[PDB]
Amino acid sequence: AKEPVRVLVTGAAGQIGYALVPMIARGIMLGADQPVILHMLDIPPAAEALNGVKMELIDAAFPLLKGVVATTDAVEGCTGVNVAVMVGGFPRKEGMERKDVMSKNVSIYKSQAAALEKHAAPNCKVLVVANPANTNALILKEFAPSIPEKNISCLTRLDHNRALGQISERLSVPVSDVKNVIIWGNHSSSQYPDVNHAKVQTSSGEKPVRELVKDDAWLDGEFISTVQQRGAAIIKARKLSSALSAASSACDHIRDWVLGTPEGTFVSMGVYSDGSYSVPSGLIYSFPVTCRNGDWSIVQGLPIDEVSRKKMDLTAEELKEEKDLAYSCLS
Amino acid sequence: AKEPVRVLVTGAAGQIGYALVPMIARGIMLGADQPVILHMLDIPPAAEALNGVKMELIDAAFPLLKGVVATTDAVEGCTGVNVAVMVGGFPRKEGMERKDVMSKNVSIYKSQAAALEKHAAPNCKVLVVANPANTNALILKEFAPSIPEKNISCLTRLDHNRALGQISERLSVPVSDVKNVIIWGNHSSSQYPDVNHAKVQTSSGEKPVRELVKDDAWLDGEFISTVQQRGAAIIKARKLSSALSAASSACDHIRDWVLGTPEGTFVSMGVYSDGSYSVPSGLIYSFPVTCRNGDWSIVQGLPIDEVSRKKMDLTAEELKEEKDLAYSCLS
Ligand SMILES: NC(=O)c1ccc[n+]([C@@H]2O[C@H](COP(=O)([O-])OP(=O)(O)OC[C@H]3O[C@@H](n4cnc5c(N)ncnc54)[C@H](O)[C@@H]3O)[C@@H](O)[C@H]2O)c1
Ligand SMILES: NC(=O)c1ccc[n+]([C@@H]2O[C@H](COP(=O)([O-])OP(=O)(O)OC[C@H]3O[C@@H](n4cnc5c(N)ncnc54)[C@H](O)[C@@H]3O)[C@@H](O)[C@H]2O)c1
Ligand code: NA
Ligand code: NA
Ligand code: NA
Ligand code: NA
């Protein structure tokens, strides 16, 4: 706890960035006893707003915060960083086509991969939040071949937490009593929110979610659609995509990765596939994982039924489609 | 830690509200072992946005969070609450006159005083953030005569933290090493940011701020102007008033009040004056305080020089002027 961790947030002058940086400064990401230095990266049109954010961080008198670099220079932003949370991008607005959203975002990741690879600290842990999350991360990984493949991840923790919240609300139990949902595959409407291995603490012990809900039709239909469409639902309610919950879930992702998952719990992370669960290797794909010693490990040995298999493959195929589109934009 | 605390945030669909609610849900306001129930109050035009916020809070799967009421009904919002953070209001926009800002905001506090007085839990701790903070709080107190006078406060903790940050930056030391600035009086450009009693931890012990800075002209001039004008500086940088830092400082205010100040530290709180330091009684006025057992206590026995006296009286006079304007709007 004497030495500080350097944490980069790209897209720092945006909505998620604004929600996220004070959570990091308060110790929510790396623990209450871990000092942090923030590096905040955005682009020249947001230079004033970015300086504004730094002014606020200073103004909060955060005792764990030992420095703030606020910049539009990617080299400076990436120098010496130990954690990189990549939020820089352009959210889809009405009128944009899927190709334009892809093209505007993957170019960022191609470019910033070189800056991270050359300047970040060696065992830097990387989390891509910007959409399309898995594909942006895959592009980053491909353009930064010197970064250990296990050190690149994308955020499906918001999907995971959304799923936990849906179960909590459906049963009217506290969310702290629900665990071990799984989000398989892409951060998109093709994801598989899987409750086959999930549990709820009750007065008579841990029970499986399906036994308490007693409505397989709901779990297999509307529950899944609800999680798949939840980001669009936030936009409908707020006229803006999620931020408070994306930031909080990015803290959870990093925190669990670095400090470890609790005994008996697994969480979802988009990680570089190795062939586990017969998912094609070389995709950024969400798996159930446990974390220990700063490393993720896919939870092996879960039974997979026919319906689960088919959903897992469908989302893998979407990820291949996205990869092809990204490639198309970059050539 | 078994029983939850009910925390009301009014103005919950706004900028500060959005920054604040997830900090409460994470345990930053009342501690990592204290479950919370959120009540979020806003007005009918923000009903959709407010529901959006609740959706995000659910989606974050906060383990300390045991319920969220999101409403436009003040009676419902105030029912059973133990902490009330009042952020509901209208920030000054270019084109508004001082009378209009006052009139639009103090009417809220007149109205909501009755709802809190009738429905909040008996020892409910109240913090007014909305501007004009001290005067809104004074109006609330006057319209809720059954609330113990020591239970009504306003936020000068952001001013206090700003002052700490300025010292930290000027000396290039970590803010964790700086303490015991004092903000006297109004949350406004008439405040007195006082460093006469402040300290910095160094390698050769706690030293007074003036001894390390060695520039009394700066401390007595530009330092004070900088703190007095800092909110306007945020607006110039961001095109919006402070939020991340206001939320964080509201957490600090409540946390210190409820859990106690550290030994050797005092903090600033706008509280109901009792005649201490020859400040007129019956104003909401920022003082240096320590907190223990859920109660503030003004730090008595600080030496006050001639210049300090005059500044303390000038800000008291502004508060009287504001009070007269508020009265004028309410009759
Ligand atoms: N669970 C998830 O993975 C999840 C949830 C919500 C949003 N998102 C995505 O996160 C991203 C950010 O959302 P937001 O609401 O914060 O958007 P926003 O537009 O408010 O913020 C994005 C910021 O990125 C900046 N940016 C653009 N190009 C950049 C570059 N080259 N380097 C650094 N910064 C750059 C922009 O200036 C802007 O300040 C979006 O892509 C969004 O779709 C993902
Ligand atoms: N240190 C401080 O004390 C400090 C710092 C910054 C801002 N402020 C003040 O805090 C307030 C909020 O700032 P913001 O940026 O969040 O503004 P904002 O406009 O984004 O949010 C205010 C919210 O209050 C709501 N509101 C209006 N009337 C209401 C009522 N009767 N009941 C409940 N809600 C109501 C509005 O709909 C809006 O959602 C402003 O008055 C601002 O000047 C104080
Ligand atoms: Na079914
Ligand atoms: Na493996
Ligand atoms: Na002087
Ligand atoms: Na007293």
Query: Do residue B175 and residue B310 come from a single domain?
Result: yes
Contact A60 B23 (CB under 8 A): no
Beta-carbon contacts of residue B38 (< 8 Å; ≥ 6 apart)? B7, B9, B21, B24, B25, B57, B65, B67, B68, B69
Ligand nearest to the CA of A85: 1
Query: Do residue B270 and residue B199 come from a single domain?
Result: yes
Compute, in angstroms, the gap from residue A289 CA to the centroid of ligand 3.
26
B85 strand-pairing partners: B9, B127
Count of alpha carbons within 13 Å of B307, Cβ hemisphere only? 10
Write out the two tokens for A292.
Answer: 């220990």
From the candidates B39, B160, B187, B253, give the one annotated as an active-site residue.
B187
Determine the Cα angle at B195 with ends B192 and B198, to 5°. 135
> What phi, psi does A270 have (nearest 5°)?
-75, 115
Cis ω before A132 (30° cut-off from 0): yes
> CA-CA distance, A303 to A196, in Å (whole number)?
9
Domain hosting A252: range is 155-331
The answer to whether A163 touches A190, Cβ cutoff 8 Å, is: no
Query: Do residue A187 and residue A259 come from a single domain?
Result: yes
Contact A237 B61 (CB under 8 A): no
Residue that is written with structure tokens 């959870």 in the block: A252
Burial class of residue A264 in the structure, from the number of CB atoms within 10 Å of its CB (0-12 exposed, 13-18 middle, 19+ buried): exposed
Beta-carbon contacts of residue B16 (< 8 Å; ≥ 6 apart)? B87, B129, B243, B246, B247, B250
Residue that is written with structure tokens 């991270």 in the block: A116
Q: Where are the alpha helices (DSSP H) in B60-177?
A: 74-78, 98-119, 133-143, 157-171
> Is B155 close to ligand 2, i.e. is its CB under 6 Å away?
yes
B178 strand-pairing partners: B200
Burial class of residue A20 in the structure, from the number of CB atoms within 10 Å of its CB (0-12 exposed, 13-18 middle, 19+ buried): buried
Query: Do residue B171 and residue B137 come from a single domain?
Result: no
The answer to whether B292 touches B260, Cβ cutoff 8 Å, is: yes
Q: Which of A8, A9, A10, A16 to mutate to test the pocket of ligand 1 (most atoms within 8 A of CB)?
A: A16
Compute, in angstroms, the gap from residue B65 CA to the centroid of ligand 2.
23
Q: Which of B59, B62, B230 sits opposite A162 (nearest CB)?
A: B59
Nearest to A192 by CA among A288, A262, A271: A288
Nearest to A125 by CA among A212, A30, A261, A194: A30
Nearest to B187 by CA among B162, B205, B164: B162
Query: Do residue B92 and residue B160 come from a single domain?
Result: no
Q: Give the residue whose CA is nearest to atom 31 of ligand 2.
A: B108
Query: Which of B154, B177, B196 finishes a domain?
Result: B154
> CA-CA distance, A144 to A140, in Å (whole number)?
6
- Residue B103's SS3 state is helix
Of how many residues is chain A composed?
331
Contact A59 B158 (CB under 8 A): yes
> CA-CA distance, B296 to B157, in Å (whole number)?
14
Count of alpha carbons within 13 Å of B326, Cβ hemisphere only? 25
Residue that is written with structure tokens 């290039």 in the block: B172
> CA-CA distance, B23 to B14, in Å (whole number)?
15
* Domain CATH code at residue A246: 3.90.110.10
Determine the Cα angle at A54 with ends A52 and A57, to 5°. 115
Label residue B261 left, alpha or beta by phi (over 0 means left) and psi (-120 to 50 means alpha): beta
Query: Do residue A135 and residue A177 come from a single domain?
Result: no
One-letter amino acid of B59: D
Query: Which of A131, A154, A177 finishes a domain?
Result: A154
> CA-CA distance, A193 to A185, in Å (whole number)?
9
Query: Do residue B138 and residue B222 come from a single domain?
Result: no
> CA-CA distance, B289 to A92, in Å (whole number)?
49
The answer to whether A265 touches A299, Cβ cutoff 8 Å, is: no
- Residue B188's SS3 state is coil
Burial class of residue A78 in the structure, from the number of CB atoms within 10 Å of its CB (0-12 exposed, 13-18 middle, 19+ buried): buried
Query: Do residue B98 and residue B200 come from a single domain?
Result: no
Write out the two tokens for A200.
Answer: 């709820």
Q: Which of B54, B72, B87 to mutate to test the pocket of ligand 2 (most atoms within 8 A of CB)?
A: B87
Handedness of CA B266, B270, B271, B275 (dihedral sign): positive
> What phi, psi does A272 have (nearest 5°)?
-75, 115
> Is B42 close to ligand 2, i.e. is its CB under 6 Å away?
yes
Contacts of A66 in chain B (CB under 8 A): 174
The answer to whether A127 touches A154, Cβ cutoff 8 Å, is: yes
Query: Do residue B165 and residue B34 come from a single domain?
Result: no
Write out the two tokens for A207.
Answer: 């029970």
Query: Which of B106, B137, B154 finishes a domain?
Result: B154
Query: Do residue A146 and residue A218 come from a single domain?
Result: no
The answer to whether B102 touches B135, Cβ cutoff 8 Å, is: yes
Q: Could you tell me where the beta strands, DSSP code E, fall in chain B? A: 5-10, 36-41, 65-71, 83-86, 125-128, 152-154, 178-179, 182-184, 192-194, 199-202, 205-208, 267-272, 284-292, 295-298
* Domain CATH code at residue B150: 3.40.50.720
B187: annotated active-site residue: yes
One-letter amino acid of B271: V
> CA-CA distance, A194 to A290, in Å (whole number)?
16
> CA-CA distance, A238 to B12, in Å (whole number)?
13
Q: Is A57 on the interface with B (CB under 8 A)?
A: yes
Query: Do residue A247 and residue A265 come from a single domain?
Result: yes
Contacts of B26 in chain A (CB under 8 A): 23, 26, 28, 248
Nearest to B165 by CA among A55, A8, A42: A55
Count of alpha carbons within 13 Å of B27, Cβ hemisphere only? 13
Write out the two tokens for A108.
Answer: 């960022």
A254 strand-pairing partners: none
> CA-CA distance, A284 to A6, in Å (whole number)?
25
| HEC string for chain A | CCCCEEEEEECCCCHHHHHHHHHHHCCCCCCCCCCEEEEEECCHHHHHHHHHHHHHHHHCCCCCEEEEEEECCHHHHHCCCCEEEECCCCCCCCCCCHHHHHHHHHHHHHHHHHHHHHHCCCCCEEEECCCCHHHHHHHHHHHCCCCCHHHEEECCHHHHHHHHHHHHHHHCCCHHHEECCEEEECCCCCCEEECCCCEEEECCEEEEHHHHHCCHHHHHCHHHHHHHHHHHHHHHHHCCCCCHHHHHHHHHHHHHHHHCCCCCCCEEEEEECCCHHHCCCCCEEEEEEEEECCEEEECCCCCCCHHHHHHHHHHHHHHHHHHHHHHHHCC
Query: Do residue B40 and residue B8 come from a single domain?
Result: yes
Number of domains in chain A: 2
Buried b (16+ CB within 10 A) or exposed e, A209-242: beebbeeeeebeeebbebbbebbeebbebbeeeb
The answer to whether B191 touches B287, Cβ cutoff 8 Å, is: no
* Long-range contacts of residues A235-241, Cβ cutoff 8 Å, at least 24 apart: A237/B48, A237/B49, A237/B51, A237/B52, A237/B55, A238/B48, A238/B49, A238/B52, A238/B53, A239/B49, A240/A15, A241/A15, A241/A91
Q: At what angle do helices B15-25 and B47-59 cross, to 10 degrees?
A: 30
- Experimental method used, please? X-ray
